[PDB]
Amino acid sequence: EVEGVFVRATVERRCRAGFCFDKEGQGFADGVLSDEQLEALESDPLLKVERCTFSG
Amino acid sequence: SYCTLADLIEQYSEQKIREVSDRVNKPATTIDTVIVDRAIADADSEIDLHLHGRYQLPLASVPTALKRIACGLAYANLHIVLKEENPVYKTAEHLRKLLSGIANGKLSLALDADGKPAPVANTVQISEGRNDWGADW
Amino acid sequence: SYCTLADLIEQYSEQKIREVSDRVNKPATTIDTVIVDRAIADADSEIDLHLHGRYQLPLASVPTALKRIACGLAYANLHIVLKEENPVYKTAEHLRKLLSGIANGKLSLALDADGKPAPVANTVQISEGRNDWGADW
Amino acid sequence: SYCTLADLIEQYSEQKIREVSDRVNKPATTIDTVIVDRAIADADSEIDLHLHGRYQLPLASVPTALKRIACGLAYANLHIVLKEENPVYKTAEHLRKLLSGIANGKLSLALDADGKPAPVANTVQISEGRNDWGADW
Amino acid sequence: SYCTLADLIEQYSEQKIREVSDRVNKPATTIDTVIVDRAIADADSEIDLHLHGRYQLPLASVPTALKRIACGLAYANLHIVLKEENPVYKTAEHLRKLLSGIANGKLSLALDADGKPAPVANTVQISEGRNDWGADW
Amino acid sequence: SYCTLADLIEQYSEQKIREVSDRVNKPATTIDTVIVDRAIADADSEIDLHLHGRYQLPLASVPTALKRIACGLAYANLHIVLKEENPVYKTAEHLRKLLSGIANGKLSLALDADGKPAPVANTVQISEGRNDWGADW
Amino acid sequence: SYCTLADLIEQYSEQKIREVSDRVNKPATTIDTVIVDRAIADADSEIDLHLHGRYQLPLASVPTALKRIACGLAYANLHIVLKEENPVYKTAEHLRKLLSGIANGKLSLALDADGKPAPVANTVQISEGRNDWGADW
């Protein structure tokens, strides 16, 4: 099981091309790959964040 | 893609692009799109080399000065042999000087259509700031 | 748009603009508006590159010196091949020197028609000023 | 308007102004007032560029040296093509040197007819001066 | 392998590659793949010499500027005898100047296709940081 | 042995090696292996002279840049008389410049096939470090 | 004896050694061993002059670079009259530059066959070191 999910329509910093804008991607508290890119992508939320059990 | 085949034709006329792009037919008849695409890609790669330290790479918009620089570099790249005193070489050198001036913070990257470019966060970084005892306790 | 086709014609006569703008008819017959527009746009882009750090980009008015500089750069851009000793190239270099002097704070951007230009707020910034105990308590 | 068509005619004779101003008739017959006006305006714009930091822009009077400088620059602007060794170009360079010397505070702007010009308040600024306890209390 | 035979053909046309690669047939008929491979390998070795101190050696992706540099150096290597004033030699010198600028931290290695290159950990190193008494005890 | 006869033939074609190696038959017929071996040995000796202070001498692997440098120096050594303006002399000088840059720590010795070279322990040396009272007693 | 007659013949071909060594027969027929021996001895003496301050004089082994340098100097010594622009003189000057670089500690004397040369004890000297009270009493 993976612990870590953000499902409150919450905002996170995801960078597409030359800018970082609101979007929900990985949104997990565990990492095995893309750690250096995840840091920029996984900036903790701006707004209310609540976690669930995807169990994927 | 800071410049396109249309931009090259407009800046240097279609005849010159045909002459410097068609390498298999003598006299030239058609413009080779692959060669022009490679030249434009090389110009963009050089410009990114110059601009990587101050702005984001995948620019969402192309500033006009960037279009002129890309067109000039692409045309200079379409010449198999380019001597030192060729005026096209001098134009390429002037454009490279403009790029270097931009990189060294002496020139600013202008407006794209109405909004500013996107500078990188290189200057933003500061430690964090520890100022307890100053929060209206 | 610091200069227009009318300005180019007035500064360099309509014959020269026709000769350097009509690339498909020999002898030239008409002035190509698209080519002139692109040349003027490139001149404006270079000028903005030089002026971005001291004034606002979308200027609401065009200073006269800016008109002369734009006309010169636009005419220099209408030449497909421009050698070093061509006098038009020397005029372009002098105008670029004027632009660089303006950027480095050695020359001021003059009046547009009656009012001053709009300098940027780069110099304005100061921290804020903490001067409690000095407010006539 | 630091110089007029009368000043240009007086300084360079009416024949030369006619020759360098009439671009549509060969041989020249009349002096084109619009071209002369644009050249004079460009000269005034350059002079204002040089003088904006030390004096007010809309000068109410024209100093005589300013008249000579404007006439020279206007005549130099009436040449479509101007080479480096052309004596008119050298005269323009000397006048620009005079303007730069004025801007850098090495030369003073002379009398207009009987009174001084109007310097800007750039040097005037001082904080305010806090000298309580020294007001004969 | 920052460049391939296809890249060389596209940049310099197949005729020139055939002429400078076929050494046994006069006139040339086919492109010798072994010679081209060795030239490309030598260009890659020089580029790695220049880039070893700032990035990882076995790059997983080839930046576009790297492709242009490799193509130029490979073509310059295909000449048995290369004089100083040969334009190909000048192009090789310019590319080497670009490489040196990259090595000295004046130019950045651009995007490969969409992501950044992989800089080495040379700057990362710090001792460790001993800050006991500051861990919220 | 950073380069072999095969490398020399591949880089300079077998005809040129035959011409500069066969000294007893006119016209040349065969490549003298002893002369080529001595030239390659001399090139290796010079390269070791340049690289002795930063890497181990008996390298277990030959970096590609080292192969190119050795081939160039060996070819330059096969000329009994070599003038200053001979292009082969210029190539040898450029390769020597590369070697000097490597020695002075401005260029890194690249990968051999997949692994790094073996730098010497010159920088490793430190006294030993006396830090009693800091061993968690 | 860093080089022998065999080395000179191999490096410069037997014909040239015969031509520059036989002074009594015209045309030359045989190589004079005494003259070659004296030239080699003079080259060795110069090399020892350059290397006396960093290595032992009676070297038990001859490094390969030393062989090349000795051969070049010996050949240069076999010319009764040697002008400045003679290429052999330039080669001798380059070899002397290599020797000077070795002496000034910018180049290292390479391996002889498998082992290092024998540096002198010039750097070893230190007073002795008085550190009583630090011998675990």
Automatic annotation (TrEMBL), chain A:
Disulfide bonds join C15-C20. This is Mu-like prophage FluMu N-terminal domain-containing protein. The chain holds residues 53 to 108 of 113 of the full protein.
From TrEMBL, chains B, C, D, E, F, G:
This is DUF1320 domain-containing protein. The lineage of its organism: Viruses, Duplodnaviria, Heunggongvirae, Uroviricota, Caudoviricetes.
